[PDB]
Design a protein around this ligand. Structure first.
Ligand code: CL
Ligand code: CL
Ligand code: NA
Ligand code: RE
Ligand code: RE
Ligand code: RE
Ligand code: RE
Ligand code: RE
Ligand code: RE
Ligand code: RE
Length: 129
């Protein structure tokens, strides 16, 4: 599923991401735009052989299992394919675990380079939240 801007924000907010670990909702919307283009089915192979999955491009090196990243872990205890569902529950729950591991949203390269420090609230303006 390809989410619309405000449709995704509402879903992320419904799933507990607004101010989760002190990150306002716009941070999560901004990151998702640059990571996945709001497309739950996004996949990208990393140089190390791992793969990023879903609307937040969660990585199989640490977080999910895709049966082709040897020597990796599965800290979210989920198949990476669950992160591509139209239901964003799997991605939100795993993102909550990632953002709590001490590095905050710096785990997301797109956020670090294109959202961190900007007016991320502009990503939720107009949305009826
Ligand atoms: Cl594996
Ligand atoms: Cl933080
Ligand atoms: Na893995
Ligand atoms: Re919906
Ligand atoms: Re929805
Ligand atoms: Re909010
Ligand atoms: Re990415
Ligand atoms: Re990545
Ligand atoms: Re703003
Ligand atoms: Re509200």
């Amino acid at each position: 599923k390809v989410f619309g801007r405000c449709e995704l924000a509402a879903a992320m907010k419904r799933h507990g991401l607004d101010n989760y670990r002190g990150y306002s909702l716009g941070n999560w919307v901004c990151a998702a735009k640059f990571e996945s283009n709001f497309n739950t089915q996004a996949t990208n192979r990393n140089t190390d052989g791992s793969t990023d999955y879903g609307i937040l491009q969660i990585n199989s090196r640490w977080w999910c299992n895709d049966g082709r990243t040897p020597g990796s872990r599965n800290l979210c205890n989920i198949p990476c394919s669950a992160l591509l569902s139209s239901d964003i529950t799997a991605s939100v729950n795993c993102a909550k675990k990632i953002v709590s591991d001490g590095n905050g949203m710096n785990a997301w390269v797109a956020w670090r380079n294109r959202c961190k420090g900007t007016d991320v609230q502009a990503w939720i303006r107009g949305c009826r939240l």
